[PDB]
Amino acid sequence: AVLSFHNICYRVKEILSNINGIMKPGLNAILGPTGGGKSSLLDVLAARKDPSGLSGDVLINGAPRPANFKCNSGYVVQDDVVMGTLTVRENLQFSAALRLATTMTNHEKNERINRVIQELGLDKVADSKVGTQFIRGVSGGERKRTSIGMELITDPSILFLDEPTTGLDSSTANAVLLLLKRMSKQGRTIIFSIHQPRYSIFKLFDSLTLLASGRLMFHGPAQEALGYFESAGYHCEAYNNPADFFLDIINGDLIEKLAEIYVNSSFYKETKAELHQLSGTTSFCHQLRWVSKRSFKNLLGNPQASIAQIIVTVVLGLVIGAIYFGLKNDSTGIQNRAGVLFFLTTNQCFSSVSAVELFVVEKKLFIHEYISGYYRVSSYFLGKLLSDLLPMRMLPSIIFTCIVYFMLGLKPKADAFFVMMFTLMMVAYSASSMALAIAAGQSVVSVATLLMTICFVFMMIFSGLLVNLTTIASWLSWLQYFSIPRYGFTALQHNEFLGQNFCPGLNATGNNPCNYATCTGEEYLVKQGIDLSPWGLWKNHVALACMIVIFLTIAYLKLLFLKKY
Amino acid sequence: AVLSFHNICYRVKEILSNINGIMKPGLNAILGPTGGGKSSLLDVLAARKDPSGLSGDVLINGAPRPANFKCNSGYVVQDDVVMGTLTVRENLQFSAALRLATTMTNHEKNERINRVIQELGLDKVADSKVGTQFIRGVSGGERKRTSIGMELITDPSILFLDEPTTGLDSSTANAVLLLLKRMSKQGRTIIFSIHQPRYSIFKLFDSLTLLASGRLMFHGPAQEALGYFESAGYHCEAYNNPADFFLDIINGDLIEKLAEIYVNSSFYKETKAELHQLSGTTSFCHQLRWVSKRSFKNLLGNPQASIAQIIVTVVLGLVIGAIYFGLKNDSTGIQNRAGVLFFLTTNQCFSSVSAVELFVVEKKLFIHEYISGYYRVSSYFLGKLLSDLLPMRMLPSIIFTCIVYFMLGLKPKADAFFVMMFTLMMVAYSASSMALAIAAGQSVVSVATLLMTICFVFMMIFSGLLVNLTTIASWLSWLQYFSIPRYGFTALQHNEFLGQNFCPGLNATGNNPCNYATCTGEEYLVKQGIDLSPWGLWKNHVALACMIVIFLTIAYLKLLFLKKY
Numbered sequence A, B: 001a002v003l004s005f006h007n008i009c010y011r012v013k014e015i016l017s018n019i020n021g022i023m024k025p026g027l028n029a030i031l032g033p034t035g036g037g038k039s040s041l042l043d044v045l046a047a048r049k050d051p052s053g054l055s056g057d058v059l060i061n062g063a064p065r066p067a068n069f070k071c072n073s074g075y076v077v078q079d080d081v082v083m084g085t086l087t088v089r090e091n092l093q094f095s096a097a098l099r100l101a102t103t104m105t106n107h108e109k110n111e112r113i114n115r116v117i118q119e120l121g122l123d124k125v126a127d128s129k130v131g132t133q134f135i136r137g138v139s140g141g142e143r144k145r146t147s148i149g150m151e152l153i154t155d156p157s158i159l160f161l162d163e164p165t166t167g168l169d170s171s172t173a174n175a176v177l178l179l180l181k182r183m184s185k186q187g188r189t190i191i192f193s194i195h196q197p198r199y200s201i202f203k204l205f206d207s208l209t210l211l212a213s214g215r216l217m218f219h220g221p222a223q224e225a226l227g228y229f230e231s232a233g234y235h236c237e238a239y240n241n242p243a244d245f246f247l248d249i250i251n252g253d254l255i256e257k258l259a260e261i262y263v264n265s266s267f268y269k270e271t272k273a274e275l276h277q278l279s280g281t282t283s284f285c286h287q288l289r290w291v292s293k294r295s296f297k298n299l300l301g302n303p304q305a306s307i308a309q310i311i312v313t314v315v316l317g318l319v320i321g322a323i324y325f326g327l328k329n330d331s332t333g334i335q336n337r338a339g340v341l342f343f344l345t346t347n348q349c350f351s352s353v354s355a356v357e358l359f360v361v362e363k364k365l366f367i368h369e370y371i372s373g374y375y376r377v378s379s380y381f382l383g384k385l386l387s388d389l390l391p392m393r394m395l396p397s398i399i400f401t402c403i404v405y406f407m408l409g410l411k412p413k414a415d416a417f418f419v420m421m422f423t424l425m426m427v428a429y430s431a432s433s434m435a436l437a438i439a440a441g442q443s444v445v446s447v448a449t450l451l452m453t454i455c456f457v458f459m460m461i462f463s464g465l466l467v468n469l470t471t472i473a474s475w476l477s478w479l480q481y482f483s484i485p486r487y488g489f490t491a492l493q494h495n496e497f498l499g500q501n502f503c504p505g506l507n508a509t510g511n512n513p514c515n516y517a518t519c520t521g522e523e524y525l526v527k528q529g530i531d532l533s534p535w536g537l538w539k540n541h542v543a544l545a546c547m548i549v550i551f552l553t554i555a556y557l558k559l560l561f562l563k564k565y
């Protein structure tokens, strides 16, 4: 194929202006400083910029662009979207399992990818972890071509690369481009935007589209690539870089002085002729099965934050298991259970600040994938929390009630012990479902951690311990239902002080003199304003279920309405 | 003033090796890549590297370095050390007020610095805020020139500049380079290390000392600056950068091939001739008066970290003031009073995370000023907390207990109001001192926060409310004394349960049947196990003062034993 664009303009102040470059198959390039449009019109061609400010017409061999054009062409980006704790043969496995595996069977995807790993120089390191900045692995010179093949699995026709060789250890930074030379001969239109090449590839190109000050510059066809500026007064000369002086008139030795050449130039007079010549979603249930495989294999591969909520949980169980040990039934038994039941509820809230890193640590990965048509939004959101949020906020609840229960000496039944295990694994979801809502769809975390714990302290006040709720008169008992650690703390106190006594040496079973005593259980709950009825126990657990579905929806309601551009 | 160094070696693996350069008065330079040794030998000549790993010698006009060599030579650095929210005239005033003017009075410093601001291009914007990243102001081309004049006040001999043009908006990047030429004509030996110049001032220098791979490289003299590489095979050619092709040898068109030409070059053999020829704390009381004037001015002009700790104090005072309001003396008066006293002492303890930014955010400021001999460490530390710690930890305490005391209805005495205002501003310093102890002398905040709020939860348990302390049996009750909000909570509970009744309609002054009642005040305190005597109240305050003196001391001790190099 062949790309072209005529009379392109754009606004957010008008950013770009009328440019009319052509783009033949081969190996193109975009040049210029960072302030110009070296990173702008790449997002115009690949349907990445917003179609509001776009005015001109961009063509693909005379025909206009299809309605599915962005999901057939690669967009290898600068910041690497390859997953860290994953195998390379597993990483290309994930790309092949979504874009093209609708009809071909499971021994047809593995022969197409072996055609790719036999390219790229990859068969030596084909079964290693790619490594992160935190864990050593495959070096940075070999991960950029690893991300190239992830969008080469489907058969493309344009590879919109996005400045590969920046911060890429220049001794082997050419190894990406000499690789790009040999793959360009098969009929691929490599269109990218390199960042400050010195001299070496200035002959090893096919067509430049240098831009400066975000306005306009040609030199579309370029193998001579320098002859346009040696007749304009401002000459690049002996002992001068050719690729740096061209934009040095804004660097201080006007750009309008070299802009005005193109009314009477040597390349504009032929390109307007051709540009005026030609002027006239699959298998939903397969998705969240395979999306579930990455986030689970990511957790096993990185055992530094996974065990970090297991050790600090079972250590904290033993400290509460050692401070409290054999709590008695004396006069200091009401206060001794009011604390240890308050600590288990509040720790299940405040240790759920670490769910902000479930969506915001890889927000750059998500927007690139959904715009490339891998999976639907609801398949990501129903699959992500089903794989990481559930089995990391459930097992650190049942270990944290199995250790503590037979060390304190609570009510030693069988059904009343499976409720305390149930309420902690329900309040920890309804605490984490709050953190998922005010985080998803952002870029930083230091405005969604100072905001969340400043709202988790206003929930800690109305909790039936520091207030004694049935004393605020009218206009501040309607904030009482908005606090998550209430409903866990009430249901934990309901099955705890039923049928117990705290006045040993006397008896008040049915003969109760001497008021202002609080020595039996069932009068203590009356004073704290909670119902003495078996419906009143399960009233909280149907409230947290409605607190989860409300909060989890407005996460998924805001993952749809985000700027996917 | 003339520098000379012969056969320098340096080990942390030896990074550096034998270098043989001579530095003439004029305007020198240091070139090369960032991974090499351009940023390494600047800290060797300017006495910033430690003299341990150094084996070679440096000479100032044949004499070695005196014991006071770093206290006459400025070290203008690449990241700015100018105070952001301060005016330029007072900023250069502070630089003059410490180094030289102990004998002259206050009408000689402005006589010298008016000559300085008449240079430098300062006479337009001499009286504004210089600004920072977060708050705007004077542009970057004027902020870097302010640091130059800041260490130009005392009459120097060498200005060891430290890569000025890093990220410095190239159209006026030559302006500071043009400014350095004119001041150098009067006996200023400028030694700096530029970062990738294009072509222009490469000829407008006096003596390069280009280096690469941290090993060695020559061209000491520089007036032709290119005549060496046209005789070495790897010739810099027409239409090629001369500034890069000298160091493009690290990219591979071998660096060591050029080093073998250095045993037979035209500059190795005559430089060894001369180097083998020539080889054969003031007014301490005045200091902390003036140091406190800066940081107090840094609170006035920056109303984003000062009034932010007043609004969240007074919007919290009403929320506490409205939840509890007119607390009674009936049977739910104990729990309703122990809550709000627990929430006041812990809120002063978790409001200590906002004081670890008091030393950490300006460590790069403190290291540069102490090695240049501005002030002693005991003047900086004792001058810091007098200005930024005292009037910002006390004023959000007495506004927090005045607005709530009559709002709740506590004991309406006169002296019992001056204990609650006193104890909260006594627990606040001891809380802020502990956050000063495990932060002072570090680089990142996110280690001294997840280590400190993991310790201020081990103090929130042993706090007289969630434990009922006389049940921890033997071997964890020795951990009872290591917790800061215990001492603030007991002394607040001591003067608030003394002399009241929580048993309306009955009376237990000397007639108390019906045990487990807690109808009087003094039965509640003995049930918690605190001393019911005027010694036990003031026992906590003398314990808190011993906590302050211990923690403030190790803040001062770990400031001394720091790697100031």
Ligand SMILES: Cc1ccc(NC(=O)c2ccc(CN3CCN(C)CC3)cc2)cc1Nc1nccc(-c2cccnc2)n1
Binding pocket: A312, A343, A346, A347, A350, A351, A453, A454, A457, B346, B347, B350, B351, B453, B457, B460
């Ligand atoms: C078990 C508990 C009970 C109460 C509290 N918090 C408070 O008692 C409290 C009091 C006042 C404020 C208000 N603060 C005022 C100033 N502004 C700026 C911020 C909020 C906040 C919290 C924390 C905890 N525990 C807790 N909190 C956070 C984290 C952890 C934790 C535990 C284990 C592993 N990792 C983290 N544990």
Ligand SMILES: CC(C)CCC[C@@H](C)[C@H]1CC[C@H]2[C@@H]3CC=C4C[C@@H](O)CC[C@]4(C)[C@H]3CC[C@]12C
Binding pocket: A481, A482, A539, A542, A543, A546, A547, A550, A551
């Ligand atoms: C703004 C959003 C996030 C918070 C929504 C709070 C609401 C939805 C929560 C707080 C209190 C909860 C209610 C408390 C009482 C009951 C019991 C029963 O009669 C129906 C459910 C119902 C009515 C709960 C439904 C969910 C509930 C109404």
Ligand SMILES: CC(C)CCC[C@@H](C)[C@H]1CC[C@H]2[C@@H]3CC=C4C[C@@H](O)CC[C@]4(C)[C@H]3CC[C@]12C
Binding pocket: B481, B482, B539, B542, B543, B546, B547, B550
């Ligand atoms: C490193 C620090 C925090 C712990 C060291 C202990 C210091 C800080 C604290 C902990 C317990 C405190 C002691 C507890 C008991 C008393 C009461 C009286 O007899 C004199 C003060 C004295 C003796 C306190 C002095 C300060 C003290 C010793």
